[PDB]
Amino acid sequence: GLPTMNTPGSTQFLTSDDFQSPSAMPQFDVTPEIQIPGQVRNLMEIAEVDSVVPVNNTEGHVNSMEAYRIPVRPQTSSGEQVFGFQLQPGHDSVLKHTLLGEILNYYANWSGSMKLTFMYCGAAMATGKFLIAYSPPGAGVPGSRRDAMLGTHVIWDVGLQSSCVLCVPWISQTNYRYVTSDAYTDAGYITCWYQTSIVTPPDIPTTSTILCFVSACNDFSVRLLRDTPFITQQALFQ
Amino acid sequence: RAVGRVADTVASGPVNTEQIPALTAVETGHTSQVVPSDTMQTRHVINYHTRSESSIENFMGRAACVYIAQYATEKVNDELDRYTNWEITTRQVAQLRRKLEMFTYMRFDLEITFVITSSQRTSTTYASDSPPLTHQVMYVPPGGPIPKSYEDFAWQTSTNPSVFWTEGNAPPRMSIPFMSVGNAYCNFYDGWSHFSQSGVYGYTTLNNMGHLYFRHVNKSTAYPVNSVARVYFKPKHVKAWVPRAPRLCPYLKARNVNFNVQGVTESRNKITLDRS
Amino acid sequence: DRVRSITLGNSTITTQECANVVVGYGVWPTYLSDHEATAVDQPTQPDVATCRFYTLESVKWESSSAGWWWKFPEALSDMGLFGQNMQYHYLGRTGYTIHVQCNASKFHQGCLLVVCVPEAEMGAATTDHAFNHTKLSNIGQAMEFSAKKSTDQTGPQTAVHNAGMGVAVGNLTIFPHQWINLRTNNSATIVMPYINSVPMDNMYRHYNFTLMVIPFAKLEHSPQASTYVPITVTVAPMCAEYNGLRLAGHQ
Amino acid sequence: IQRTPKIQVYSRHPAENGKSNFLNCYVSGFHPSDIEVDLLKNGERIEKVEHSDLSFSKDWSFYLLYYTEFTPTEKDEYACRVNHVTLSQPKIVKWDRDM
Amino acid sequence: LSLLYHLTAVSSPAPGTPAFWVSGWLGPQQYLSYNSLRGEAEPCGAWVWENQVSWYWEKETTDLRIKEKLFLEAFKALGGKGPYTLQGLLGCELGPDNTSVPTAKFALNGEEFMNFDLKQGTWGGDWPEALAISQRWQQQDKAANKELTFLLFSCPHRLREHLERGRGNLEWKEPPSMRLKARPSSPGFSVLTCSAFSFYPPELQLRFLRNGLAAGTGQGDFGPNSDGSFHASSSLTVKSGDEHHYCCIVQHAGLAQPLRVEL
Amino acid sequence: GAQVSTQKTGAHIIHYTNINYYKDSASNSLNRQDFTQDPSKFTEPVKDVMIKTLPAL
To answer: Record's family (chain F) (predicted)?
Structure first.
């Protein structure tokens, strides 16, 4: 017949190939699809949805709802630190189990800008200002509010519009960063500081709550599929 | 511009306006669309990245193992009989289940590939000349007559699709179309089976894909071998709806969603960062 | 603007501190089209006898409350002609309009999360044991979560930080949701379309979606303020239609 | 879903006096979880009574044989006393020597 | 002749009692007992009167530890508050000469609700409690194949292992002791009894006659004994006169004539 | 059929030929080149449209 020649790579099973194969049940009449609402055509559509960040995960708070409640209270001296974490959105313990981190942990490269939304859940009569800052990774962690005002930051004033968005910009020497973070592609630090204080009229409780929210901006991107280091099994589930 | 490519960043300047892009209300259930060119001064950057690796086709389109079926050439126990079976489900491995549990209703064709390996069982001697083994994998639809044992009437596969494979060649592979009676595979089902709200609870009531029976075509060997047939599934032509939140606690069973409670995340010492 | 008035049937829900009206996945509830239906008989469509605002019982929000859940359509199984049409019919199809409401003050603080989870298949309290149906949902009783784990023999796992589904409770925002912040908001209104794999479904064997109300920031106030703040749920079916008429159910 | 038992009292051997005989008491047709059968000698509880293997008939109703090593004479009258979830009082059945 | 197993498991057992117990019946008399409180199966000293050296009785013990776990993993996917007594009938009967016919019935709360099919499915019933147990039982992934090779392959081979081993129990021909006695009653009538004691075969048809003509069977009762023997009874309210003519023409399987007994 | 289509390359001879051989649509290869998307169902599920630069309330 036709004179062929089997190239290297024949009779192999590469698990991520793209080939045709004979159907087992020929001329099967499938059921018609209908208009089910809420179709997903890309996993990045999921990663653009906010999910509340467990910033208060100091043990043992991961076994309650207190992992999400970031406490704020009236201070004596200003310029204190509210919270802070490194920006490792698939490896840091604060971010890697939010909705962004579970999508990122299926991949190995990530790129783009990120949003951080802070909804103040105190009383309607309390008033405060906060400084929410991002620091690129050159110099280390900012140890004071004076070191934090030199970075990318935004000064949030609470009021009727009860949430301010810090948009973490993409500053990197590489086009992508590794998800499981290493020393070469560090991404920096997110800190938040008391701009003035929390000032309240009498007969209001002291401690309040700020909820964080992480998502992805419209230029986010992932690459290089893998498995997650989250789910394990020893045997087949009977 | 092409489709799939992410958006650029327009050049911004200093502003002092009534407009407040940074302030919003989360209470309305609405994600803010604050691009970085709203809260700082940016340069025009022509972004060339695409989102090809993140679509539902490429996210699912890699073949994953779903079952490990074992069957010998000589009965030793009911478990290591001449034949074995498997109820077709994707809920027995932990890798593919967590991917398919990200969406509520999915609709896809399938591509089933078998990696079959035999190993000679431990005895007091092993010197035997054997011809190459031939395996049979018969797919039984819901309602079909099942084989009772070896040499059954029902291995004649008068209408059931079957495959025959001699060891040493390429692995077998056949494609399965969309098989459900509804309009999408229900990955979840918050409901009961009977109308009195009792019986079995959960997703097992709908997904009846059928069985899958394995055996050796060869009648016997001189010394018994133990074959193992790993089954690989690859979803192709995938549509998905209603994205669920990804599972956190590891699984316990194949018919349930039961779990032990776990932390929301890992712990750390304090809420602040304390270096210079 | 902040005010919004909703009129359905012979009832009318008004509010003066509203956030907005989140609507499902952008899809308004409609009737079933001719190129999608399967059952061949003429469906019944009572437009105002069943598409109106039914008000469930009120729950008490405390500073130690973990959360509540209702399961639909089973939560409206006796509210009027929506209950009677569920019994005399084999199939049903509807969308909803869930309006949760909770006013406190300008001196209270707290935050609720109102989610409609489609097919919130719940795990079991103790494993290796299936549970009763009356511990999943009674007819109108607000089934509630718990702070710690639950060791019930015949119930669901009601640890609120795992939300009954073995999932992180912070990630419940991809389902259609709103927040009731006592600082700003007062009510939360969600419109949910019919979400199922089959175009119509039986309304007794299958809970279509679960409404959850989870307090994230806990309720705090002075001891001299109003100690009792209630939460009230007001559900209204939308574009309901039924098929397969037979005797009264539901066995 | 509830059954009431049936007591049938009889002897193994014919009641020939002097030698020890066996009073086989038959309880049948009952569905509790637990039943209490007791053998009696004119109001005296016999201490040592042997139990048979508790089983069920073809219609999913249990049956159980209790028996003692009794000496039949004219004055030795016997009875069976059974306890159920259905019957409040324990049912008296008097043993007749003619069967 | 047929081998049969009588499985029963209760949810909340009475203390001091087993929660699961087996009674094996080679036809009409019992040969096998098992429970949970001792954890092994023993004979009654009735059928074999031998001790098999770890080749026959050691596999019956290991077989019923499997059946104990299947009968205790049942409540466990019953979500009711009430107690449950799960019953089970297992075994096979012999065909014409070969090809034994099996049987497998189960009963929850004294009512038959499921029965392991033969083709598909392995277990099934229209009751809501039947699908819950059937989905629970096949979760262990091999118990359904355990009973498929049980009813068609092992216990009929065990039956042909028993078809020629113990034939002295298949010839138990004990002719009974029959003692016509009588009691008095209400004025005008009398109460008659004819009874039979300690007989092995299960067939006996005892009736009452006036002179030479049949007058009725009476109320026939039945009960076995502590030694593989049975018992019958028959009573009738008869006339206070003519007691010297009521005859009891009754055959037996250990007898070749329907012997007459006297008052 | 000869559905010649473009290849997946980088940015700053590139065609490929594909022939279907079987009589079922479920025997084909994957549809790896469909990157159409809209996240507005999940990020903006709101009735009244919310302008970005305006107050939300």
So the answer is: Belongs to the picornaviruses polyprotein family.
Single out the residue of A64, A46, A50 nearest to residue A222, CA to CA.
Answer: A46
Q: Tell me the two tokens of residue A109.
A: 């490269």
Domain spans, chain A: 1-238
Which tokens hold the place of C56?
A: 């469930």
* Measured distance CA(C102)–CA(C187) in Å, rounded: 6
Residues of chain F with C-beta less than 8 angstroms from the C-beta of A41 = 34, 36-38
- Domain positions in chain C are 1-251
Range of the domain at E154: 1-171
- Residue boundaries of the structural domains of chain D: 1-99
DSSP-derived letter for residue A102 is H
Task: Note whether A45 contacts F39, CB cutoff 8 Å.
Answer: yes
Neighbours of chain D (3+ CB pairs under 8 A): E
Determine which helix (DSSP H) or strand (DSSP E) holds C20, and give its type and residue range: strand C18-23
Tokens representing A162?
A: 């009860």
3-class DSSP assignment, residue B85:
strand
C-alpha dist (Å) from residue B166 to A20, B133, E18, E215, F29: 21, 6, 53, 79, 26
Assess whether E60 and E135 both reside in one domain: yes
Contacts of E85 in chain D (CB under 8 A): 31, 33
Q: For residue A1, what are its two tokens? A: 């017949």
Tokens 């039984």 correspond to B140
Enumerate the residues of chain B whose CB falls inside 8 A of the CB of residue E74. none
Take residue E102 and report the two structure tokens written for it: 């099996």
Let me know if A213 is exposed, middle or buried by CB neighbors in 10 A (0-12, 13-18, 19+): buried
Query: Could you tell me the CA-to-CA distances from E58 to D66, E42, E52, E64, E166 in Å, in that order?
Result: 30, 10, 9, 10, 20
Does the CB of B22 have a partner CB in chain F at under 8 Å? no
Domain count for chain E, please give it: 2
Does F9 touch chain B if contact means CB atoms closer than 8 Å?
no
Instruction: Name the amino acid, one letter, at C35.
Output: H
Q: Which residues of B touch E124 (CB under 8 A)?
A: none
| A39 contact E CB<8A | no
In 3D space, the residue among E208, E217, E206, E203 whose CA is nearest the CA of residue E254 turns out to be: E203
Cα E206-E212-E217 angle, rounded to 5 deg? 25
Experimental method: cryo-EM
Measured over the CA atoms of residue D43, residue D44, residue D45 and residue D48, the dihedral's sign is negative
Which chain A residues touch B7 with a CB distance below 8 Å?
218-219
User: In sequence order, what are the residues at sequence separation of 6 or more whose Cβ sits closer than 8 angstroms to the Cβ of residue C172?
Assistant: B245, C113, C115, C117, C163, C212, C214
CA distance B256 to C80: 35
Of D44, D81, D77, nearest in space to D66 by CA:
D81
Eight-state DSSP code of residue B133? P
Q: How far apart are CA B188 and CA B101, in angstroms?
A: 8
**How many Cα atoms sit within 13 Å of A69 on the Cβ side?**
22
- Find chains touching chain A: ≥3 CB pairs under 8 Å: B, C, E, F
- Phi-psi bin for D73: left (phi > 0), alpha (psi -120 to 50), beta? beta
Of D1, D12, D60, the CB nearest to E197: D12
| Contact call for A and F: 3+ CB–CB distances under 8 Å | yes
**Half-sphere exposure (Cβ direction) of A33: Cα atoms closer than 13 Å:** 16
Q: Are A238 and E142 in contact (CB under 8 A)?
A: no
Continuous segment of H or E residues that includes residue B104: strand B103-120
- Whether residue E236 contacts residue E192, with contact meaning beta carbons closer than 8 Å, is answered with yes
